[PDB]
Amino acid sequence: EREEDTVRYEIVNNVAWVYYNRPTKRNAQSPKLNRQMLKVLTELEFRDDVGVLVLGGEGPAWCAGMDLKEYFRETEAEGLAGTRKAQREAYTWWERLRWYQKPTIAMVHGWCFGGAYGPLFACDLAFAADEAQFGLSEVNWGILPGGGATKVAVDLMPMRVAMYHAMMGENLSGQDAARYNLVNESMPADQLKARVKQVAETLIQKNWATVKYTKDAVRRVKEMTYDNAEDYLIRLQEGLNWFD
Amino acid sequence: EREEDTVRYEIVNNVAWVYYNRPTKRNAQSPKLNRQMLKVLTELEFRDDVGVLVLGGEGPAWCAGMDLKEYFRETEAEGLAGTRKAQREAYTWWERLRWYQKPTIAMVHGWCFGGAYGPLFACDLAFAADEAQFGLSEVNWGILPGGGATKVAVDLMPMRVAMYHAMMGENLSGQDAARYNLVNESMPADQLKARVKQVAETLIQKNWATVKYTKDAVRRVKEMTYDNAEDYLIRLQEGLNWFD
Amino acid sequence: EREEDTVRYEIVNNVAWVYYNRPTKRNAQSPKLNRQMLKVLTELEFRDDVGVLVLGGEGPAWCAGMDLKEYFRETEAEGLAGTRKAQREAYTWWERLRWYQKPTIAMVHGWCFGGAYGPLFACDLAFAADEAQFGLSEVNWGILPGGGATKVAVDLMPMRVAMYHAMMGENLSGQDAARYNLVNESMPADQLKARVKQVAETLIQKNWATVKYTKDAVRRVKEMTYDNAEDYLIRLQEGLNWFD
Amino acid sequence: EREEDTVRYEIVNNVAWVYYNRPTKRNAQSPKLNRQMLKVLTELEFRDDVGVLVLGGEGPAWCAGMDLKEYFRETEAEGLAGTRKAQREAYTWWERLRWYQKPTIAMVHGWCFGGAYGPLFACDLAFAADEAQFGLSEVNWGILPGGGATKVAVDLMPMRVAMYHAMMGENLSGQDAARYNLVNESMPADQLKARVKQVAETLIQKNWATVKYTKDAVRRVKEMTYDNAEDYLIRLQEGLNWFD
Amino acid sequence: EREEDTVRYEIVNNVAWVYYNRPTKRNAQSPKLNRQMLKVLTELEFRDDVGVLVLGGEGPAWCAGMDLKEYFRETEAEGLAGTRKAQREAYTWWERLRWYQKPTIAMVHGWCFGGAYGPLFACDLAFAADEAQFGLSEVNWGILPGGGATKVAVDLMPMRVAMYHAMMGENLSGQDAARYNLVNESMPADQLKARVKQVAETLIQKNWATVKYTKDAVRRVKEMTYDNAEDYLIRLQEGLNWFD
Amino acid sequence: EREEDTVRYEIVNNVAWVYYNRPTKRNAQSPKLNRQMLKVLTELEFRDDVGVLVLGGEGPAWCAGMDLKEYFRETEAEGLAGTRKAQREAYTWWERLRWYQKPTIAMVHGWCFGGAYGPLFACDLAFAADEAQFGLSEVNWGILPGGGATKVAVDLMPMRVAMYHAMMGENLSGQDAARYNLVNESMPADQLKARVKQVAETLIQKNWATVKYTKDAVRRVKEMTYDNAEDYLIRLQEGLNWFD
Ligand SMILES: CC(C)(COP(=O)(O)OP(=O)(O)OC[C@H]1O[C@@H](n2cnc3c(N)ncnc32)[C@H](O)[C@@H]1OP(=O)(O)O)[C@@H](O)C(=O)NCCC(=O)NCCS
Ligand SMILES: CC(C)(COP(=O)(O)OP(=O)(O)OC[C@H]1O[C@@H](n2cnc3c(N)ncnc32)[C@H](O)[C@@H]1OP(=O)(O)O)[C@@H](O)C(=O)NCCC(=O)NCCS
Ligand SMILES: CC(C)(COP(=O)(O)OP(=O)(O)OC[C@H]1O[C@@H](n2cnc3c(N)ncnc32)[C@H](O)[C@@H]1OP(=O)(O)O)[C@@H](O)C(=O)NCCC(=O)NCCS
Ligand SMILES: CC(C)(COP(=O)(O)OP(=O)(O)OC[C@H]1O[C@@H](n2cnc3c(N)ncnc32)[C@H](O)[C@@H]1OP(=O)(O)O)[C@@H](O)C(=O)NCCC(=O)NCCS
Ligand SMILES: CC(C)(COP(=O)(O)OP(=O)(O)OC[C@H]1O[C@@H](n2cnc3c(N)ncnc32)[C@H](O)[C@@H]1OP(=O)(O)O)[C@@H](O)C(=O)NCCC(=O)NCCS
Ligand SMILES: CC(C)(COP(=O)(O)OP(=O)(O)OC[C@H]1O[C@@H](n2cnc3c(N)ncnc32)[C@H](O)[C@@H]1OP(=O)(O)O)[C@@H](O)C(=O)NCCC(=O)NCCS
Ligand SMILES: COc1cc(C=O)ccc1O
Ligand SMILES: COc1cc(C=O)ccc1O
Ligand SMILES: COc1cc(C=O)ccc1O
Ligand SMILES: COc1cc(C=O)ccc1O
Ligand SMILES: COc1cc(C=O)ccc1O
Ligand SMILES: COc1cc(C=O)ccc1O
Structure with a gap:
């Protein structure tokens, strides 16, 4: 409903904890979230009290990809101008995060699907819950893995793994996502926030x-x-x- | 002996099972096999009853590489024109398979050596028997890994692994070929056809x-x-x- | 102290065993070592009695990177000309080794830090002691991983692993350096010379x-x-x- | 003064004629102009009555580069956040223009310096008056040709010519600009608009x-x-x- | 009518003079011509009495592009299989020519449109008559310049010139083609063959x-x-x- | 005879005027000249009184290429070690020049053949006399244009022109060299030095x-x-x- 409620953050001890905040919508990237995420990232980027940014999610999903209703169906009803405006909002905040002034960390407790692969790649480091599931499900609703997701799979994982992942639309567990280097490490959910917090504190001690x-x-x-x-x-x- | 006997196929339930058919010659790629493989691939490619193509081999080898006698020795006796004509037949069917209209699967039960790496790479997915052996033995008969095989090793495996593989001409087991991502998965021989069949059936259910x-x-x-x-x-x- | 004492070698049965020889300085690459290493590599390269070159180190380190005093502090006191002359000596011998006429092997028993990553990458194959430690510690003294070391990490290891390695300046064990393909293999220290010797003897039997x-x-x-x-x-x- | 006045446009025969509108400041690119250009371009791009966009300038300048006061001095005063905000606004509209939905034409009647090279390259076609002047005067102000302007020179002109243009900071006439293919055509100032109208009119009759x-x-x-x-x-x- | 009549050739002084042979159809590239060109090129390539190949055209055309009836309409009627079969036949002979064993010369006396750009680029050297005309008329027929013809324009001509050539679909004269380096040289129609004979004759005297x-x-x-x-x-x- | 005499230089108004100094041997690049050029370039590069370096030639040649006796025949006599030592000495000074700390200008008054193309390209700017001659005569001696000379042709000149230049081994005049952008400018021999002095003098007044x-x-x-x-x-x- 409200644009400024789709992302929340808290800065604690020089770590910006940023969350996708559409838990009931499995944190689907809608144009409202895409716009608000850019606003929050842009405001945090150069603060002298933010040394590290952690991207988390509220509820059972990290990010279930793009909002089928608000990102695809509603924008395409507004024709090419609508599709282009929506694409630009998504690509622009993924790039802002990719080239962020501060080190970036993905804390992936839950579902990471499709369009979430842009933000996942845009984080410098990534830590997953064993219970997390990563999937390119696009093939399973008849589209190409877009939003750069094909390139994300090819840039992080070995070519055979990437090909199986994109073609078969099966999920990787957290432990498999670590084995294939989609993320740095997988651990039980209840250790994940402590590990991410430790990594953030280590980076803020460096120049x-x-x-x-x-x-x-x-x-x-x-x-x-x-x-x-x-x-x-x-x-x-x-x-x-x-x-x- | 006969050109049209060097490759056999069977289409069952929208899966084309294609086999190298020179079992007594360890399915060596001869000019006759190269020509017939192009003929079979070209005829199957756009049939509406072929959704997936599986490349297997008859006898103990998947493919023991190029035919030393018929591909190298006999063609070079016909000078440069002979060498070029033979190279073109090999490269052309590997490219046809690489860019095939339908998803491609390598079912590697046995020996995969040298020139077999082009076809192995040209298959989108690859499943191996634990008992399979993969080797670039070229160094061990005094030639460079040709037919693109050096690039295959570098595009699928980590650089150190590829360098050891090409320089030392030692074999990888199926399980090592899975660990280093030359193939997607390794399993005991007697499960390999059931696994490949399952993967083929999953792809034919997609768009x-x-x-x-x-x-x-x-x-x-x-x-x-x-x-x-x-x-x-x-x-x-x-x-x-x-x-x- | 003496330029020609900073590197030692021995040719035994067509294997050149070359050692960094500043054990008390953890084999720090000083301009004297850089110059002498080029001299030794250049003299060995085309000898008909040298089929393989092994790069080892004396004392507890393989190579603790560049000499902070003699490579960075003293050269920069001589201005830009000093810095450039010193850089050129380092880059030139790493390139000589990278494109060496004979196969090259890194035998890494101990510490491999920072500027050692150029020589490590320049060796075709690499074998480590379980007790070895590999680290890009540059971030931990406020500089970028230079001397190509960032590119070495990206060319050998998966992107996530490389990013953690460069940003966090933590050490990999020998076994982790094998898992992430920075080296080919890790084994207990007391087996490492026998394994390297075996690999060298195998290469000298090839063309x-x-x-x-x-x-x-x-x-x-x-x-x-x-x-x-x-x-x-x-x-x-x-x-x-x-x-x- | 007013952000909304820094750019003007008129639609004539389904051609958008867009003009840098700071004639007394030689249409220097200030943050205000950068933000307003983006607005204007974004608003015209998907209009079904706009087939072509022409970029022109009011006064004796096409575009004399970045505003040395408003883009450089005033933004650096706000440290790195201010510099990055101002760079993003410039790069973003050049890119929107470079990938425009509609064909784009630069109509270069006068001065085209430095940062104007972005917009120049971002136009698909470019027609100059003979009395136009093109230069990378950056070197004479002691900076690199930034804003991609060095790459624009190398991408459009022969490497010797780009090298001289960038290193000597001397101007090319419309005639020399046409000779070295910085623009398509050069003609006397009084034929310029009619040729541009003709070209825009031919494009609108195509699919x-x-x-x-x-x-x-x-x-x-x-x-x-x-x-x-x-x-x-x-x-x-x-x-x-x-x-x- | 006859596939074998669509191309002719004569060997003179160890130069193969090869001609598009559909003069009444402006030597348009039909599947028949595409298959026969490949045959002819393949047969001449390794002849010890052929030192050079010249590609010419009978009638007022060199090559007016692809046959709009036989290559486009008749093949699309046979759906995707027919289109791909026809594309493969075109791309395959352009490539055989581009990598020919013998030096290749385009002798362009008349019309060179669209799909003719492949063969034009595939010739190492190119000599035009002044009254020749070169154009990418694709845009006026509502298609992209395909058959690699857009890349031929960008690879041979300055980017502004390629952009205008592709977007406006206007013809270049032999003189302008020579000026923008689409061909080496332009001369009056009645000097063309003699210059080409001279060039072919100089090449045959080299190793x-x-x-x-x-x-x-x-x-x-x-x-x-x-x-x-x-x-x-x-x-x-x-x-x-x-x-x- | 003497290695130290193969290159001379004079500093005038903070311009280093460096000359190939084997006029009777058409300033052919011998190992002696290659080693002495490196020495001279290395010694001038970081002098606070040298702002610009001009490369010229004594006698009727600028540089007629590699010394066919001292660089090719005498070094091949010493087998592969001798060839590689001689190649390294050539490539190393071309590279030192190509990345020089100071701006570089080729002053080409006469013959510039074959291996001279390295040094030609390594100069940032190049001014020729009209009576200068440039050619890749390699093909007429039965070798490929080596020493990067084929890439210099393709990087500086339009692809058709590079192709003709390399395949026909015919010379370009200073005027044609300027037309195809091998050099910046061509002028009568008696204006050459004054234009070069002017250019060097403009550069020294810049940062x-x-x-x-x-x-x-x-x-x-x-x-x-x-x-x-x-x-x-x-x-x-x-x-x-x-x-x-
Ligand atoms: C992520 C997922 C496994 C979670 O399953 P779950 O916890 O059982 O959640 P449900 O699907 O039952 O319902 C969650 C809600 O979020 C919505 N939702 C989930 N994923 C969504 C998406 N990608 N876009 C839009 N809405 C989505 C559902 O419609 C439902 O809304 P509603 O109850 O108000 O109708 C599942 O929702 C899913 O498969 N999502 C789609 C992932 C995808 O295809 N991504 C491609 C986009 S690039
Ligand atoms: C594949 C291999 C391990 C199988 O071993 P095996 O089951 O014991 O088979 P054998 O070699 O004893 O004999 C199999 C037959 O195939 C032939 N053959 C095997 N590989 C062949 C090849 N690459 N080319 C031609 N013939 C080959 C053998 O000559 C023999 O023919 P014959 O009995 O009629 O004389 C072994 O044949 C081999 O090493 N092949 C060569 C692999 C190679 O070097 N490939 C490089 C090509 S790119
Ligand atoms: C390699 C290392 C772990 C070994 O630890 P150790 O065995 O306890 O050795 P110490 O550091 O106590 O002392 C070894 C000696 O070598 C010197 N040394 C070690 N690494 C050095 C380096 N990179 N440059 C210069 N000197 C170095 C020490 O100053 C000491 O000299 P000294 O006793 O005469 O003063 C440690 O020396 C180290 O961290 N080295 C720096 C690695 C590095 O930062 N590399 C970056 C360069 S690119
Ligand atoms: C065009 C030029 C060559 C001489 O033309 P001219 O008709 O004599 O113009 P002037 O120099 O008198 O114009 C000066 C005025 O324009 C403005 N102006 C011109 N170029 C400007 C720039 N790049 N930034 C800011 N203001 C600029 C000045 O603020 C000044 O305002 P004023 O009239 O209140 O004094 C000269 O203006 C110039 O060199 N401009 C800068 C070019 C440049 O370096 N561009 C690259 C920047 S990325
Ligand atoms: C050459 C041209 C400009 C005018 O020349 P012209 O001497 O007036 O020639 P015509 O147009 O009268 O030639 C028409 C005949 O040539 C044939 N022809 C010419 N170009 C052809 C093409 N590209 N495909 C098929 N047939 C073609 C027609 O089938 C027709 O046969 P017809 O004599 O039985 O009617 C015109 O033929 C032309 O534009 N051709 C197509 C060019 C093109 O678009 N090429 C790119 C395709 S990839
Ligand atoms: C310049 C040239 C075209 C004719 O000029 P010229 O004034 O007639 O000069 P000459 O051929 O009489 O010069 C011959 C002398 O120069 C020397 N010389 C010229 N080019 C030389 C080269 N590339 N290598 C070695 N020596 C060379 C010869 O050793 C000979 O010495 P000599 O006077 O004792 O006989 C001719 O010298 C030439 O073609 N040189 C070689 C050019 C070449 O192929 N360069 C590419 C090599 S990478
Ligand atoms: C088809 O367009 C898109 C697809 C995706 C994910 O697969 C993300 C953003 C997009 O705009
Ligand atoms: C040397 O030529 C070839 C080598 C190989 C395999 O190593 C395959 C095909 C070839 O044509
Ligand atoms: C900052 O310069 C250097 C850094 C390094 C290693 O990090 C190695 C050589 C160098 O010249
Ligand atoms: C140094 O920064 C810039 C320079 C330029 C042109 O020289 C254009 C935009 C920039 O941000
Ligand atoms: C759209 O297909 C093609 C187009 C062209 C030239 O425009 C040449 C070959 C093709 O197959
Ligand atoms: C074949 O070796 C060389 C050739 C050339 C120029 O043709 C220059 C340097 C070389 O080493």
């Missing part, structure tokens, strides 16, 4: 600028030859010398 | 056009930046809207 | 030219599309036909 | 969907191998068959 | 193996970084040392 | 750090997508803000 440059370098040198990446990392360090 | 676009997207977005892959998947879905 | 072309092809086809890699491997084999 | 898929194809296949581009153009036509 | 490795190098190093291209050209010369 | 970051940007963004290039140029300016 914040050094952490920003390092996470960026990791994502960027993926799309370079070894030779070009060598020179790139020298130019980055000259940038960090200015910021530090 | 066939959606499965084609998804498998293609997986292979294609490997060779794109994240940013270019995002737009690509939007253009693909517009294509699928036309086909569906 | 030396075939091993050189294969290791190069593995590294090169990483940075090509599948289609361009297919043609590339044909051109390489024409090159090997000339050398053999 | 609008076809012109959109074509201009996107041209831009995209530049960052693709020939082989990948052949498949891509088939995927695109499948898309267009849905959209027509 | 044929050297000319083949050189034209392939030029085409390949375009899709390589400078650094990767330096190593590649050394690998190529090792190949040529085997082949000479 | 030297800005000119270095700019010329490197131009070279680097050519091997980047537009999207990756936009981010890269921001990272570079952060670097320059440290260095200024």
